Amino acid sequence: MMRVYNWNHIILLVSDDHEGRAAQKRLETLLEERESK
Amino acid sequence: KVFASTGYGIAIQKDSGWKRQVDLAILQLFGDGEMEELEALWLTGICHN
Amino acid sequence: VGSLTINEERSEVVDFSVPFIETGISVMVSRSNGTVSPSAFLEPFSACV
Amino acid sequence: ERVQNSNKKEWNGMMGELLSGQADMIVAPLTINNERAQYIEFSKPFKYQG
Numbered sequence: 001m002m003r004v005y006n007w008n009h010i011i012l013l014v015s016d017d018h019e020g021r022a023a024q025k026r027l028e029t030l031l032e033e034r035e036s037k
Numbered sequence: 038k039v040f041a042s043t044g045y046g047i048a049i050q051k052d053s054g055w056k057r058q059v060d061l062a063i064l065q066l067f068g069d070g071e072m073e074e075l076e077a078l079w080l081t082g083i084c085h086n
Numbered sequence: 087v088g089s090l091t092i093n094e095e096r097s098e099v100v101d102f103s104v105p106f107i108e109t110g111i112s113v114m115v116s117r118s119n120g121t122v123s124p125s126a127f128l129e130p131f132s133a134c135v
Numbered sequence: 136e137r138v139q140n141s142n143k144k145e146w147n148g149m150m151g152e153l154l155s156g157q158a159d160m161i162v163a164p165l166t167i168n169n170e171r172a173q174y175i176e177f178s179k180p181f182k183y184q185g
Contacts, residue, residue: 043093044179044183049100049103056103065169067106067167104179105179
């Protein structure tokens, strides 16, 4: 959804549970990018 | 009493992310004081004492 | 990597690193020195005696 | 400093507030190391020291 409308700010709320923690881990691994050049 | 107060650094292209990790290594150099030893190797006078 | 200074009209163009050597503008002379004791021993004794 | 029975090293002081987001920008006798530059972005040194 970022660079759909070029969006660049987010504040999250995690469910204190394995579901929210695992989703947070997945998005944290997703945010490891922009290694240019 | 130097009338100016500035510093010597390195020029990088704009928006080049490598300079962060370069400055981390610069502080790694600063963390052990090797540049004082190279100053003893390079920047040392005679009757400047 | 040459010995150039970080300056305002230079930092606006490109990206700069952390300065690693403190620098400053001064002047230098080749001066023989001395002093003057002006017509006395400058306040010779204790003035009470 | 390491938080007890949680094996987590946590900053204190000014960095206990700024890295926790509780504070805005800081003017200080900012002694610069590798770790503070790792977690806090820095300006150029205002007053050279030793």
